[PDB]
Design a protein around this ligand. Structure first.
Ligand SMILES: *[C@@H]1O[C@H](CO)[C@@H](O)[C@H](O)[C@H]1NC(C)=O
Ligand SMILES: [Ca+2]
Ligand SMILES: [Ca+2]
Ligand SMILES: [Ca+2]
Ligand SMILES: [Ca+2]
Lengths: 48, 276
């Protein structure tokens, strides 16, 4: 809410100060990436 | 007395036969009976050992010489099968899905094997002649082989990547591997839980007989496809009750021992050839 005004008790995060002093919002976790890549399985090399 | 040399022995025809020695060997020998657990389970009599001992005594054996060793099944019994009696008889239940395992077990115990250790991590191994095999036993022995050409490079496989190796054994309690002779193979064996040995088939083991309980003629104790001999020490029995099986074994113990002979490798006269 903004003081000295009738606009109050609204839910959300206004763009005035989303940082709230905090220098960074952190979220940690795991991430799994099933991808396709270039591997010959050490099977494209010279014979010798 | 002359233990290191093979001297010819000259015998003469017309030499009178000696009396029967069956009684003397029964009195001075030990008999081991190997049966599966299901046999004892079906019999369901805590005193059946004493009954069989008394019946054997009625047949001749002193009542301290017949031993009964119990094994869970063919697969478990195949791990280091130790047979120490003068005469060993193995009742092997037949399973249509375990033909190769039964054949391997019989090959291992019905024949004498001279085995040297194997360091698959150190040497490339080759089989010299038809008598040479790779016998491996353990809780879970998986064997993969990569044949190498004259330049030591693999054939159909890469020595660096064991994934390309040709798998010959998977989760085997016992396996007798036969590869092409005169070719060096890089071996990948789960040594952590199984031991592989480079063995030669010296010849028959005459003090071990195997009765296949309720199957057909399927044992192949020779890797040669052109031969599947049925030696006198491999018998077959139809069955419904294990008590009948044991009664048949007791009643025809004379014939069963007749089919067998004292271990040639054993006894004093075999000294300084391989053992005692
Ligand atoms: C062998 O058996 C015969 C006939 O039963 C008997 O006379 C003889 O004493 C036995 N023993 C020997 C050593 O010949
Ligand atoms: Ca097997
Ligand atoms: Ca391959
Ligand atoms: Ca071979
Ligand atoms: Ca064969």
């Amino acid at each position: 809410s903004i003081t000295r005004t009738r606009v109050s008790r609204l839910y959300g995060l206004p763009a005035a100060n989303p940082n709230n002093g905090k220098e960074y919002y952190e979220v940690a976790g795991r991430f799994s990436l099933i991808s396709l890549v270039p591997s010959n399985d050490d099977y494209q090399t010279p014979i010798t | 007395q002359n233990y290191g040399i093979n001297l010819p022995i000259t015998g003469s025809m017309d030499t009178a036969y000696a009396n029967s020695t069956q009684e003397e060997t029964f009195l001075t020998s030990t008999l081991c009976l190997y049966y599966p657990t299901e046999a004892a389970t079906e019999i369901n009599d805590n005193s059946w050992k004493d009954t069989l001992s008394q019946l054997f005594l009625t047949k001749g054996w002193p009542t301290g010489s017949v031993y009964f060793k119990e094994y869970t099944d063919i697969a478990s019994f195949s791990v280091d099968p130790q047979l120490y009696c003068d005469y060993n008889v193995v009742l092997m239940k037949y399973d249509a899905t375990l033909q190769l395992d039964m054949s391997e077990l019989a090959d291992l115990i019905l024949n004498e094997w001279l085995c040297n250790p194997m360091d698959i991590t150190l040497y490339y191994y080759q089989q010299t002649d038809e008598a040479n095999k790779w016998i491996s036993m353990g809780s879970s022995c998986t064997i993969k082989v990569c044949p190498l050409n004259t330049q030591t490079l693999g054939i159909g496989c890469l020595t660096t990547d064991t994934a390309t190796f040709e798998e010959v054994a998977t989760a085997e309690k016992l396996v007798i591997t036969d590869v092409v002779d005169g070719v060096n193979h890089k071996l990948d064996v789960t040594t952590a839980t199984c031991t592989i040995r480079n063995c030669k088939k010296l010849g028959p083991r005459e003090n071990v007989a195997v009765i296949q309980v309720g199957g057909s003629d399927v044992l192949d104790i020779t890797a040669d496809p052109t031969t599947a001999p049925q030696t006198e020490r491999m018998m077959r029995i139809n069955w419904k009750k294990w008590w009948q099986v044991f009664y048949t074994v007791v009643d025809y113990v004379n014939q069963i021992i007749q089919a067998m002979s004292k271990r040639s490798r054993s006894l004093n006269s075999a000294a300084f050839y391989y053992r005692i």
